[PDB]
Ligand binder design. Structure first.
Ligand SMILES: O=C(O)c1ccc(NC(=O)c2cccc(CC3CCCCC3)n2)c(Nc2ccc(F)cc2)c1
Length: 190
């Protein structure tokens, strides 16, 4: 049961032809988000690996905490972390927690999908946000994602997040269902 945390990049209509990164203040009026959004890989819909636990505007940007819950994904990633020379090649030698290091290295980016800013000028009809993706490429404003086994340790890793902000983030995290979160749809290509 893994947690992920970090500052996100906000991307409108990602993957499509007219993709556009957004200024955080273009969506901060629609934060915070406390209902769970799917966490996918690289904006691919059949790769749900978990669920967000909170998206909060904070001095320095928009912070995401999430839970990685897919058994198929966690088993695949942990197996690779323990047996794959390829997975371990770009990580420091002999790390204590290989799974956390491999995710921190290979999926450093958190990317929040939003509707186009034209819809954001005047009263959106429906949900502003669609998902958060763990991404191999495309990190700009976001921090490098931190993966851990407890949410407190994860949020702590960001000095750009004050004691108060960290208390607020953690408040909504503990109130979130953990075993009640629906099962994500990721299937192992192995
Ligand atoms: O169609 C194919 O055969 C196929 C081919 C290649 C694939 N991936 C990459 O090239 C790739 C590149 C960068 C990062 C990642 C994420 C992964 C890194 C290692 C630890 C777990 C996270 N995957 C995938 N996608 C993939 C999904 C999860 C996973 F654990 C491994 C691969 C599928």
């Amino acid at each position: 049961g893994l947690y992920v945390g970090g500052f996100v990049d906000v991307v409108s209509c990602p993957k499509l032809e007219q993709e556009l990164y957004l200024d955080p203040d273009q969506v901060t009026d629609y934060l915070p988000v406390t209902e769970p959004l799917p966490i996918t890989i690289e904006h691919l819909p059949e790769t749900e690996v978990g669920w967000t636990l909170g998206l909060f505007q904070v001095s320095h940007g928009i912070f995401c905490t999430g839970a990685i819950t897919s058994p198929a994904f966690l088993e695949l990633a942990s197996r690779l972390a323990d047996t794959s020379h390829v997975a371990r090649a770009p990580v420091k030698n002999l790390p204590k927690e290989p799974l956390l290091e491999i995710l921190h290295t290979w999926l450093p980016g958190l990317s929040l999908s939003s509707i186009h800013p034209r819809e954001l000028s005047q009263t959106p009809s429906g949900p502003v946000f669609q998902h958060v993706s763990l991404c191999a490429l495309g990190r700009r404003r976001g921090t490098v994602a931190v993966y851990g086994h407890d949410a407190e340790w994860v949020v702590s890793r960001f000095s750009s997040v004050s004691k108060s902000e960290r208390a607020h983030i953690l408040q909504h995290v503990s109130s979130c269902r953990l075993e009640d979160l629906s099962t994500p749809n990721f299937v192992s290509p192995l």
